[PDB]
Design a binder for this molecule. Structure first.
Ligand SMILES: [Mg+2]
Ligand SMILES: [Mg+2]
Ligand SMILES: [Mg+2]
Ligand SMILES: [Mg+2]
Ligand SMILES: [Zn+2]
Lengths: 337, 44, 159, 88, 138, 132
RNA sequence: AGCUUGUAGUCCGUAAGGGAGACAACCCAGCCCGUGGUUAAGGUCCCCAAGUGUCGACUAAGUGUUAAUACUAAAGGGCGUCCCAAGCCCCAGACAGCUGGAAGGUUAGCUUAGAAGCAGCUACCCUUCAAAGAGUGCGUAACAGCUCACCAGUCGAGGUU
RNA sequence: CCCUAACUGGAGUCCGGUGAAGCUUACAUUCUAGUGCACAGUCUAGAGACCUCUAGGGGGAAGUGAAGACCCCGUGGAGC
RNA sequence: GCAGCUUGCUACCUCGAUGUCGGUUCUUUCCAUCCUGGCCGUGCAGCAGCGGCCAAGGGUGAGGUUGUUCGCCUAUUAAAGGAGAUCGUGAGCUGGGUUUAGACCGUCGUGAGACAGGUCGGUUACUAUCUACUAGAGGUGCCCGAGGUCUGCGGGUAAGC
RNA sequence: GCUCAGGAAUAAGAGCUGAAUGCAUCUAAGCUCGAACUCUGACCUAAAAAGAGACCUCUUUAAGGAUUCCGGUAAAAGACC
């Protein structure tokens, strides 16, 4: 039979397609440290989109030296608190948590997520970790941070979000010293990312609920005379005669949306401090207006408004150091009508 | 350009007449299939 | 038809000319080669068979042609005396309905053999023995059975 | 020994590698590894390779010869690179 | 405990399987990553690659990658693991990569049969090499 | 070919009839195929501004009629955006009979043509009079 | 052709039980019930009862680990490896190398200028010395040397068909 | 049709009331190869499998409906 | 000699029914390689060819006639490869052809009728019991009681060509 | 709007060292390179991994969980925030 070849419908690199087990994106891989100690991640909340007019400066690009319009996503980033230090041990069966020390001072609203740890061992526990590193058992150190969404207004929740980050250094002793220095303090977004650099974004995407094969995998409808015979948006065949089973690679209906996704090489265009420079007339739709400091990201970002966005320094970047963008105009038109 | 060393180490070898594998000079047997007859790499 | 269609000996012989009909002729023209009038070759080697089978006449003709060419090219026109031995007396029939009255009709002729039975024989001098072996080895390549070469007379001379 | 027709070659020892620059109109220079302590010296159109390990020097020479082979033309008309005039 | 330092794989597995089935205390195989598998390099690699990529995703054979998992699977085949006797036997076997901390300094014994000294030639590979060729970090 | 600063949707579709706007001697043409387009299953070939495509003459002088030729699109009714942010559109599609390189057989072009074909094919730019 | 049609014996049909992975007709066995004992076919690393059994060799391919069998690949080749026999040269000295020699004449007959040992008749081109050639090849209009065949000094034990 | 998208009303999804029929030797959470009247969920050897429930389209149960309408046979019929 | 992808041969299964040809949709397997990756030879200057070896990751399209498979033709294209899955796929679709009952043309027959020749017309049934798969939940098992943050035995991928 | 490599081990193949067979030889041991293939690295999922996990905190007539109530970044019912 003279068959006409067609690429497979949809991608099997994301299966099974089920609801994310949490509302907070989790990072599986941390980059390699190539500089002084610092955190490798940050968190914020998505607001909406605008566009800016910036003098093009991408090297070797066609549109170099002339004005362009770019879509940007505005992200609110109130300062985070470093609440704990965690130590990991390496063996045959991979890393294993072996110690944690919490900060003495914490926010009273953290009681909504977990009961507040009490100030027991602080100096003795830290020196315990130091002795462990001194006897060459500890391999790496990670920091535990949370957000403080009570300062914002467009986000209804008042309970913090807890997650683990990574410190970037060239030695375990340096990581431990830096973690001791920064433990139990507030870290601003400027201390993590420099303006003009690239980042990686993770977030839970918008949920569409249960969807059929056509909208879930993008299969073809029924064409022509077949479009009015009873099956229009159903799949053609569920399999062959043999094997006598339906393969897992056949398109079917189920959950669509609310998965975890990652975007690569998004550029940071502006680190702001005052919210009046991005707020349109009438505020953003369904959000309100910006009150704290923010950040502008070139392009789009996964997830809807009022969703938590995690950021980490690039893991597969190609291009060399880019530079500070030259923003000329930031659109503050009404998003409404 | 015909030079002594280049021709010495480039086109001074025998060729199997069945699988086209190149062999040494003082040989009578393809090292990979054992065919009896070997010709010589074509000159100019 | 293919060679293996008529090569096994499973059924009785079928050779009486006066009962069957319409047997096609043969291609092999002469059964003696080279210097027939000479009788003073001290070495007499021959090609023998290792298994019972049937040889078509076309295979015998091809083997004879190739041996003739090799021997004449190397030994010389007067330096040998080749002689084929087995003549094709059998008859081959090919059905041509289905199995309804499946009895066949004559299509060719074949020569049955027996294990260790001589087929060819070449006589040469002492200086052309290797050429004789070289010639007899190609002839057995066209033949439908495994074949070995035996030096019958003058074994002490060559060996 | 070195041979070339039109494009002069810059054989330069640097670190544990031998860099071949401008080979048949080449912008990306090729790299040949040096095995062991096999000290090599470049002098005009010839290369001498010293050492105390026989397999080591042999493999170093083999790498240098194999890196500089032009693999899309005819050996009759193109004959360039480094060739061994005498084994170890 | 049994030290798998330089022992034939099938010989070791057969002895351990039989003396598990006889009924006793549990057994421990340590250093189960330099056990020997006699045979040429290419043939061993080819057979293990074909064993690895053979199943169907929902219900096909899931051949393990880790070295101690491979040794356990090899012993699992010389044993009626579907019956009650076999399941009880499988409950008393523990193969470790390297040396676990609790079995540190423990008294060892060996199977005198399965010895690489009892091999004619030098045509063999070690189990960790096949484990790393199959893509396992151990 | 050389990249364009702007982004052009592929509006016209294989089977479309365009009104050629030069003085070569043809009025209407029929897009047969598009140069440098692979495609996928069931998808008709499509062409946009600055795309060289083979056509057929449907209305014109008897000598030119029934001839397979090459031509490019100079205008299209489907909108496309400038580099600095703006959308441009026309009232009607148009095409000019040319050669493989880009020399138009006609020495006179009627009406405006998009500036992007003027940059991609300089000859069309020079032969035109008004560019928008 | 696990096709069709004969014939002798024995079977399945109508035949348990034991062994072959399962197996109508293949091997042991033709069978009333209960208990003890020894064997047949077949097996004895584990699954699985009983040998990680003994003696002498072979295979390096996971080849093989498959009585019969409707279930198991051929011609041809192998300076792969293990054996037998037959010839030939041989420590006063065989083979592979180290060496040079291959000098007398010739530049062989050759019309093209030239196929001058290597297009095309011939013959050992030396009376003579290991060698000396009508002679393969890098070279080669022709050659030419470099030198093929072919012997000679040289090592120092088996070599070769 | 390229190439599909949004929307409207009736069903469906969820809740209350009412309330049937048709396949059914038994068991049954399966998948691969072999074997077997040569097209096995049940035999042989492996591989997998914690149980219950809801929604969904129909891969398989050589799915169900039915003593084949095609071919042959019957010293069976009818019409012409 | 291999394959069983064309046509034959046989009559082992199915006549108290295993729903035919082609196309459409969707998934997968083989390599005996059309393009993409790597090599070898050439009577390979370069460009481009010719022949062979490894390699099945990705790609292999749009249209005119015809029911067609097959095949011819057109303009592109890196190329527009061939086969298997009950000649994959009718409890998914279609009904163009073949295969009922009606009628016409030609040829046979004395005639009823026939064609293995052509042409026009001609109903596509079912509420899913079991299993498989796609997603969503409730339990029980491990466990001091609860919460949080992680590791990673394993599974998937083309995520790029 | 984004959509990479780099590395390890290899196939055909190209070499080094090297004897049986004094020499020579890519192979008989041994070694070095070598593909859109394989593995690793990115990415999605994953303590119901029966070897059924690690660490920390809060508290054992409490911590904490559910139902009622006002809602939506979620939603066929459940679940989730
Ligand atoms: Mg009987
Ligand atoms: Mg029986
Ligand atoms: Mg009768
Ligand atoms: Mg069906
Ligand atoms: Zn060869």
């Amino acid at each position: 039979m003279a068959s006409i070849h067609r690429p497979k419908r949809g991608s099997l690199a994301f299966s099974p397609r089920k609801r994310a087990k949490s509302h907070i994106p989790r990072f599986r891989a941390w980059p390699e440290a190539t500089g002084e100690p610092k955190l490798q991640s940050f968190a914020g909340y998505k607001v909406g989109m605008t566009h800016v007019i910036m003098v093009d400066d991408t090297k070797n690009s066609l549109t170099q030296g002339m004005e362009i319009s770019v879509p940007v996503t505005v992200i609110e980033t109130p300062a985070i608190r470093v609440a704990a230090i965690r130590a990991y041990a390496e063996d045959s069966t991979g890393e294993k948590a072996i110690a944690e020390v919490w900060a003495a001072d914490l926010d009273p609203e953290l009681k909504r997520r977990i009961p507040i740890p009490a100030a027991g061992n602080q100096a003795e526990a830290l020196e315990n970790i130091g002795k462990l590193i001194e006897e060459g058992r500890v391999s790496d150190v990670r920091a535990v941070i949370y957000t403080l969404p009570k300062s914002l207004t467009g986000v209804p929740k008042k309970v913090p979000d807890i997650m683990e980050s990574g410190i970037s250094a060239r030695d375990l002793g340096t990581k431990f010293e830096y973690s001791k220095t920064i433990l139990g303090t507030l870290v601003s977004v400027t201390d993590v990312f420099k303006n003009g650099t690239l980042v990686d974004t993770a977030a839970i995407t918008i949920g569409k609920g249960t969807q059929g094969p056509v909208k879930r995998w993008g299969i073809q409808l029924m064409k022509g005379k077949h479009s009015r015979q009873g099956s229009l948006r159903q799949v053609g065949t569920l399999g062959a005669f043999n094997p006598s089973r339906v393969s897992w690679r056949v398109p079917q209906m189920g959950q669509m949306g609310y998965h975890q996704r990652t975007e690569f090489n998004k550029r940071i265009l502006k680190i702001g401090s005052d919210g009046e420079e991005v707020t349109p007339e009438g505020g953003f739709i369904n959000y309100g207006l910006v009150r704290g400091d923010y950040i502008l990201i070139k392009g789009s970002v996964p997830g809807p408004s009022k969703r938590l966005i995690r950021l980490r320094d690039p893991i597969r970047a190609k291009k060399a150091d880019l530079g500070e963008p030259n923003i000329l105009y930031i659109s503050r038109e009404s998003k409404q009508g | 350009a015909r030079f002594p060393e280049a021709e010495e180490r480039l086109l001074n070898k025998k060729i199997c007449m069945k699988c086209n594998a190149r062999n040494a000079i003082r040989a009578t047997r393809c090292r990979k299939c054992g065919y009896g007859t070997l010709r010589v790499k074509s000159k100019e | 038809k293919p060679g293996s269609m008529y090569r096994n000996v499973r059924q009785r012989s079928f050779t009486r000319r006066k009962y069957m009909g319409g047997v096609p002729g043969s291609q092999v023209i002469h059964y003696d080669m080279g210097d027939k009038a000479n009788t003073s070759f001290p070495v007499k080697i021959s090609l023998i068979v290792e298994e019972k089978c049937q040889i078509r006449h076309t295979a015998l003709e091809a083997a004879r042609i190739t041996a003739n060419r090799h021997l004449v090219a190397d030994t010389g026109k007067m330096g040998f005396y080749m002689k084929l031995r087995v003549y094709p007396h059998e008859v081959i029939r090919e059905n041509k309905s289905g199995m309804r009255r499946a009895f066949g009709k004559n299509v060719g002729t074949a020569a049955r053999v027996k294990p260790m039975q001589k087929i060819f024989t070449v006589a040469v001098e002492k200086q052309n023995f290797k050429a004789a072996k070289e010639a007899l080895w190609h002839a057995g390549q066209k033949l439908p059975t495994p074949c070995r070469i035996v030096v019958d007379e003058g074994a002490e001379l060559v060996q | 020994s070195i041979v070339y027709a039109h494009f002069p070659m810059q054989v330069k020892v640097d670190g544990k590698t031998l860099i071949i620059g401008n080979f048949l109109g080449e912008k990306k220079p090729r790299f040949a590894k040096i095995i062991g302590e096999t000290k090599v010296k470049v002098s005009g159109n010839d290369v001498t390779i010293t050492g105390i390990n026989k397999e080591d020097v042999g493999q170093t020479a083999a790498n240098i010869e194999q890196k500089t082979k032009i693999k899309r033309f005819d050996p009759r008309i193109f004959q360039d690179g480094i060739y061994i005039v005498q084994k170890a | 405990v049994i030290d798998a330092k330089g022992l034939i794989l099938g010989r070791l597995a057969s002895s351990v399987a039989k003396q598990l089935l006889s009924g006793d205390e549990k057994v421990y195989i340590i250093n189960a990553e330099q056990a020997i598998i006699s045979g040429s390099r290419a043939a061993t690699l080819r057979e293990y690659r074909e064993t690895r990529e053979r199943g169907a995703t929902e219900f096909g054979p899931y051949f393990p990658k880790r070295p101690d998992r491979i040794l356990k699977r090899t012993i699992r085949g010389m044993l009626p693991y579907k019956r009650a006797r076999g399941r009880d036997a499988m409950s008393r076997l523990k193969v470790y990569v390297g040396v676990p901390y609790e079995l540190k300094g423990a008294e060892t014994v060996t199977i005198p049969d399965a010895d690489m000294r009892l091999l004619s030639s030098s045509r063999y590979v070690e189990l960790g090499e096949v484990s790393q060729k199959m893509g396992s970090k151990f | 070919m050389k990249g364009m600063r702007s982004n052009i949707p592929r509006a016209l579709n294989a089977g479309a009839q365009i009104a050629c706007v030069d003085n070569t001697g043809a009025k209407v043409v029929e897009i047969i195929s598009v140069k440098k387009y692979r495609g996928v299953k069931n998808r008709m070939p499509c062409a946009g501004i600055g795309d060289m495509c083979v056509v057929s003459v449907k209305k014109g002088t008897p000598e030119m009629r029934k001839q397979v030729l090459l031509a490019v699109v100079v205008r299209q009714k489907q909108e496309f955006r400038r580099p600095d942010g703006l959308h441009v559109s026309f009232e009607d599609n148009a095409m000019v009979i040319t050669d493989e390189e880009g020399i138009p057989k006609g020495t006179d072009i009627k009406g405006p043509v998009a500036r992007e074909v003027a940059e991609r094919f300089p000859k069309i730019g020079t032969t035109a009079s008004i560019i928008v």
